[PDB]
Scaffold this active site. Structure first.
Site, short mmCIF file in Angstrom:
data_model
loop_
_atom_site.label_atom_id
_atom_site.label_comp_id
_atom_site.label_asym_id
_atom_site.label_seq_id
_atom_site.Cartn_x
_atom_site.Cartn_y
_atom_site.Cartn_z
N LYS A 144 1.20 -22.17 5.17
CA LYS A 144 1.13 -22.15 6.63
C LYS A 144 1.25 -23.61 7.06
O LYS A 144 0.26 -24.35 7.05
CB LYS A 144 -0.17 -21.50 7.12
N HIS A 145 2.46 -24.03 7.45
CA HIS A 145 2.68 -25.44 7.74
C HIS A 145 2.34 -25.78 9.19
O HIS A 145 2.16 -24.91 10.04
CB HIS A 145 4.12 -25.83 7.40
N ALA A 146 2.25 -27.08 9.47
CA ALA A 146 1.96 -27.53 10.83
C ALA A 146 3.09 -27.13 11.77
O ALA A 146 4.27 -27.18 11.40
CB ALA A 146 1.74 -29.05 10.86
N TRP A 148 1.24 -32.46 9.22
CA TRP A 148 2.58 -32.97 9.45
C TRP A 148 2.83 -34.39 8.92
O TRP A 148 3.98 -34.83 8.94
CB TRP A 148 2.90 -32.95 10.96
N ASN A 149 1.80 -35.12 8.48
CA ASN A 149 2.02 -36.55 8.24
C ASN A 149 2.86 -36.81 6.98
O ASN A 149 3.64 -37.77 6.95
CB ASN A 149 0.68 -37.31 8.21
N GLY A 181 -6.14 -31.34 6.58
CA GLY A 181 -6.06 -31.41 8.02
C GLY A 181 -7.26 -32.11 8.61
O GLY A 181 -7.94 -32.87 7.92
N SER A 182 -7.53 -31.84 9.89
CA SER A 182 -8.64 -32.48 10.59
C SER A 182 -9.99 -31.90 10.15
O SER A 182 -10.07 -30.82 9.55
CB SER A 182 -8.52 -32.31 12.10
N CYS A 216 -4.28 -40.17 5.67
CA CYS A 216 -5.67 -39.80 5.45
C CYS A 216 -6.45 -40.94 4.79
O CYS A 216 -7.55 -41.30 5.24
CB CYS A 216 -5.74 -38.55 4.58
N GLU A 250 -9.50 -31.10 2.26
CA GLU A 250 -9.21 -32.53 2.30
C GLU A 250 -8.95 -32.90 3.75
O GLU A 250 -7.89 -32.59 4.30
CB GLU A 250 -8.02 -32.91 1.42
N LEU A 251 -9.91 -33.59 4.37
CA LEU A 251 -9.99 -33.64 5.82
C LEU A 251 -9.87 -35.05 6.39
O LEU A 251 -10.39 -35.33 7.47
CB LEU A 251 -11.30 -33.01 6.30
N1 LIG Z 1 -3.86 -35.66 6.02
C1 LIG Z 1 -4.92 -35.35 6.82
O1 LIG Z 1 -6.07 -35.23 6.40
C2 LIG Z 1 -4.68 -35.16 8.30
C3 LIG Z 1 -3.44 -34.74 8.72
C4 LIG Z 1 -3.19 -34.55 10.08
C5 LIG Z 1 -4.19 -34.82 10.98
N2 LIG Z 1 -5.42 -35.26 10.57
C6 LIG Z 1 -6.47 -35.56 11.66
O2 LIG Z 1 -6.48 -34.58 12.66
C7 LIG Z 1 -6.17 -35.16 13.93
C8 LIG Z 1 -5.36 -34.11 14.72
O3 LIG Z 1 -4.22 -33.89 14.00
P1 LIG Z 1 -3.47 -32.30 13.97
O4 LIG Z 1 -3.82 -32.05 15.44
O5 LIG Z 1 -2.14 -32.59 13.45
O6 LIG Z 1 -4.47 -31.65 12.92
P2 LIG Z 1 -5.07 -30.20 12.59
O7 LIG Z 1 -6.22 -30.23 11.64
O8 LIG Z 1 -4.97 -29.65 13.97
O9 LIG Z 1 -3.83 -29.48 11.71
C9 LIG Z 1 -3.67 -29.41 10.34
C10 LIG Z 1 -3.28 -27.91 10.00
O10 LIG Z 1 -4.36 -27.04 10.27
C11 LIG Z 1 -3.88 -25.97 11.05
N3 LIG Z 1 -5.00 -25.57 11.84
C12 LIG Z 1 -5.77 -26.36 12.73
N4 LIG Z 1 -6.78 -25.64 13.27
C13 LIG Z 1 -6.65 -24.36 12.71
C14 LIG Z 1 -7.38 -23.18 12.86
N5 LIG Z 1 -8.47 -23.13 13.71
N6 LIG Z 1 -7.02 -22.05 12.17
C15 LIG Z 1 -5.93 -22.14 11.34
N7 LIG Z 1 -5.13 -23.21 11.09
C16 LIG Z 1 -5.55 -24.31 11.81
C17 LIG Z 1 -2.73 -26.57 11.94
O11 LIG Z 1 -1.85 -25.59 12.41
C18 LIG Z 1 -2.05 -27.42 10.83
O12 LIG Z 1 -1.37 -26.57 9.97
C19 LIG Z 1 -5.34 -36.41 13.57
O13 LIG Z 1 -5.44 -37.29 14.66
C20 LIG Z 1 -6.18 -36.95 12.36
O14 LIG Z 1 -7.37 -37.53 12.81
C21 LIG Z 1 -5.70 -35.44 9.24
#
Ligand SMILES: NC(=O)c1ccc[n+]([C@@H]2O[C@H](COP(=O)([O-])OP(=O)(O)OC[C@H]3O[C@@H](n4cnc5c(N)ncnc54)[C@H](O)[C@@H]3O)[C@@H](O)[C@H]2O)c1
Ligand SMILES: NC(=O)c1ccc[n+]([C@@H]2O[C@H](COP(=O)([O-])OP(=O)(O)OC[C@H]3O[C@@H](n4cnc5c(N)ncnc54)[C@H](O)[C@@H]3O)[C@@H](O)[C@H]2O)c1
Lengths: 460, 460
Positions: free
Chosen positions: A158-160, A134-135, A210-211, A266, A232-233
């Site tokens: 598959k968006h946030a 979402w950022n 994502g995370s 990130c 890219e995490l």
């Molecule tokens: N640009 C980046 O690298 C980025 C972006 C957002 C968050 N983060 C990190 O993650 C922490 C939590 O943020 P979030 O809670 O928004 O992140 P997240 O990793 O939960 O979400 C990112 C995406 O992954 C999907 N996702 C997560 N777990 C999944 C799974 N098991 N199966 C399928 N899809 C899945 C979510 O629906 C979303 O689309 C933040 O505090 C930060 O530390 C990093």
């Protein structure tokens, strides 16, 4: 209504609920996958120059809804409106840049084989499943979708779950541009729906931003299904300042690097690692500069910071701050949740942060700077590399030889010497260690999801 | 002494036990990881031209033990001795080729950023864990180890448990070449040991050459541990012959492509797909040419085939033959286990193989040709792509325009037009679908295990 059944949008500046969207069901998933398979089957047969012209059409369609898009980004996740406008502008420019430079990057490669018998061709792989955060609700999607589609692949987003208004508007932009729905598509899938899609033969590969936890969960599934992935995490980027640095520029770049997008980047500057001789001067100037940042309603252009995107993530960040202070750090600025209905956290600075502390070892995904003192340049490099993350880094020093030597020894995918860290279409993006693997942008983002195919005639 | 406790070598030509080696224990694994970490720490600081000279030293050390190495390959897994000598020669030449061409592939790369402010650098990643098979016990190791080590990485080999004599001799060659402790290493690890290493922070990435089953098991673990992997798995390559082919050359290439290394080649020609007009002539000529292949003691240079490497895999292959015949195919040649102590299976040809049959859907990893009749070129392409595998392919036709159009639509990583399929340092190697992902050789095998790092100065 809870996330057990719906994606939910809430305005973080007010706490008001904006929208809900139920998770995709079995028929929804099957229909999405049928569309993507049929779309790729036709798209892979188009000419590269036609796809390049379609990229220009995407850029035009995006600019024609630029303000509608920016307002939606700001409303759903709190970004200051001028930063949301800049995100749109950068995303539209990416379309034009790949349209101009992308085709040449996809030309067949000659080889050293005699008599021009063998060339390397870049073929598309198929439909790429993309899991996004979402950022940067627009830029994260476009950063991959533009090169992936130019290479003749399909892209299935598959968006946030907190930015599905953004997701629906992006789909409208691609529709405005004439991109077939089986080439750019999207689905409001829950985690089990993602698992089902990774196993389906109509998904060729997976890309995740994502995370760390999300990348490990999805990467294991991609590997089990024999699908390539790019991960890219996120990061905990070090920002190194040596005694001979341009101090006033270092402070400007430090504040910009940490507090952009209310800290939710990130590749943000997250760990400031300052040589002992200049640490007092840097720290006092950094606090004064961070204190000058205005925070409030992100629709007001006077504000440099908005609210954080997620109420639960502000709670997590403040817990990280409290744990770091309990471990021995000093609070120099901010460090308390703001009262009220909005999800506001002020610019915050922690000093005397050691490598044992929470704010040094975890990603601080909000407006919290950690400052660590280094004995000398060798210690600063050790501190910089003492991380599970490895996305990018900054070094400020007037000793350009030393900067080049340190860059070669930094365990990360990008190093910025005496300037501002940023992503850019012209250079590679992506990291090492728990920040992931694979590279985006430039020719790397075009080739990651190609079938690199040797074609060899008359090998006799 | 069972495989529950030991790696075991057995000569497939005679059935006699050659050697046993107990699995690595906890201390052995920890020791190897510590030495790999220390070796990489120092190796990554060496100069590229020094490492290129060390590659030349590896080639010299290998050529100095060339007959000893070839005889070990033949003794442990049955390969005709002149093919074992060719494997040694190709592997030593690879060292010289990467020493000559590799350094230029690792030079900093310019970007379109103004005023030459940003370059792309190719940095070492770390120690790469390598899981390798028995069919080319030297070449499979060198194909990866040579570029991996040239780029400044370390290499830790887990070889197949029936070729640990080869593994120990390869280690002696690297020792003879003066490659430092930990830069090249090896472990007789069982599957649990591999799992432990993948989870360990001192392994940076993983490369696997083996079965589809092994790739999925290991790829899932690499993803869960956030380690990049390259997977080079099985193949069931199609070999398409159209009505206008050079029939004499097509038959020669077909026989060589299927029966090389007693059929035990990932990119062997395995599914012959012949247009209906030429099918009778091709089939009769193919049977006659395959029948002319001599089989016997692989130490005797008159023999084109040796025994198969593994007694249980000959049993598997014959079971696949019997199933395919029971499903309606016709036996044109071979198709029975040879009596005696050796693991011999004769050159075998099955006709009337349809897409529903075992020999069309599974990898036939032995000297068994499957022949399928195609109605026309479009049907041939459809049959060729109707596979879980996608490593490489051959097309024989005098219509080069049609051959290149078909190549663009073949779901595989290599296409050979009117010639002999083979791997070669100068071109990319690797496939799609269940054959895996990632590429080896040329600059691809050099770059897959680099940290691709943007370095950008004065971004202001
Ligand atoms: N640009 C980046 O690298 C980025 C972006 C957002 C968050 N983060 C990190 O993650 C922490 C939590 O943020 P979030 O809670 O928004 O992140 P997240 O990793 O939960 O979400 C990112 C995406 O992954 C999907 N996702 C997560 N777990 C999944 C799974 N098991 N199966 C399928 N899809 C899945 C979510 O629906 C979303 O689309 C933040 O505090 C930060 O530390 C990093
Ligand atoms: N694509 C290529 O480059 C290429 C080249 C040569 C061979 N191959 C394939 O090799 C296969 C035959 O090789 P094999 O008979 O050695 O097959 P295999 O997959 O049984 O073993 C190969 C290696 O994987 C290891 N292994 C297997 N399962 C494992 C697990 N669960 N955990 C850890 N290690 C594990 C084995 O010990 C061995 O070292 C054929 O499919 C052939 O096509 C592919």
């Amino acid at each position: 209504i809870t996330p057990a059944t719906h994606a939910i949008s809430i305005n973080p500046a007010t706490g008001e609920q904006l929208s809900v969207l139920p998770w995709a069901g079995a028929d929804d998933i099957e229909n999405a996958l049928q569309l993507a398979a049929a779309g790729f089957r036709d798209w892979r047969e188009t000419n590269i120059d036609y796809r390049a012209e379609k990229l220009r059409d995407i850029g035009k369609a995006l600019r024609a809804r630029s303000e509608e898009m920016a307002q939606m980004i700001t409303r759903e996740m709190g970004k200051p409106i001028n930063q949301a406008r800049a995100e749109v502008a950068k995303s539209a420019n990416l379309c034009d840049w790949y349209a101009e430079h992308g085709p040449a990057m996809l030309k067949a490669e000659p080889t050293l084989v005699e008599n021009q018998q063998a060339v390397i061709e870049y073929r598309p792989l198929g439909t790429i499943l993309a899991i996004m955060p979402w950022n940067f609700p627009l830029w994260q999607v476009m950063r991959g979708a533009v090169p992936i589609i130019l290479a003749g692949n399909g892209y299935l987003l598959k968006h946030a779950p907190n930015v599905m208004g953004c997701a629906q508007l992006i789909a409208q932009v691609f529709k405005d541009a004439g991109i077939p729905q089986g080439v750019y598509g999207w689905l409001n899938a829950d985690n089990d729906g993602v698992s089902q899609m990774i196993k389906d033969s109509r998904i060729a590969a997976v890309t995740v931003t994502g995370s760390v936890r999300a990348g490990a969960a999805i990467g294991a599934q991609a590997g089990a299904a024999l699908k390539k992935c790019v991960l890219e995490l996120g990061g905990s980027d070090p920002f190194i300042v040596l005694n001979d640095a341009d101090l006033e520029l270092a402070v400007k770049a430090a504040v910009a690097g940490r507090y952009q997008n209310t800290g939710q980047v990130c590749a943000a500057a997250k760990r400031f690692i300052i040589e002992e001789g200049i640490a007092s001067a840097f720290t006092e100037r950094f606090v004064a500069a961070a204190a000058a940042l205005k925070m409030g309603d992100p629709r007001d252009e006077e504000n440099a910071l908005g609210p954080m995107a997620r109420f639960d993530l502000r709670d997590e960040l403040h817990h990280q701050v409290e744990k770091t202070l309990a471990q021995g750090a000093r609070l120099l600025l901010g460090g308390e949740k703001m009262a009220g209905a909005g999800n506001y956290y002020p610019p915050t600075v922690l000093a005397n942060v050691t490598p044992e502390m929470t704010a040094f070892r975890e990603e601080m995904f909000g407006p919290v700077a950690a400052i660590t003192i280094a004995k000398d340049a060798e210690h600063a490099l050790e501190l910089a590399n003492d991380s599970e993350f490895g996305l990018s880094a900054t070094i400020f020093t007037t000793d350009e030889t030393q900067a080049r030597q340190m860059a070669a020894r930094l365990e990360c995918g990008g190093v910025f010497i005496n300037g501002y860290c940023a992503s850019d279409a012209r250079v590679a993006f992506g990291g090492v260690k728990k920040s992931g693997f694979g590279r985006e942008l430039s020719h790397f983002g075009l080739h990651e999801f190609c079938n690199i195919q040797t074609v060899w005639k008359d090998r006799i």
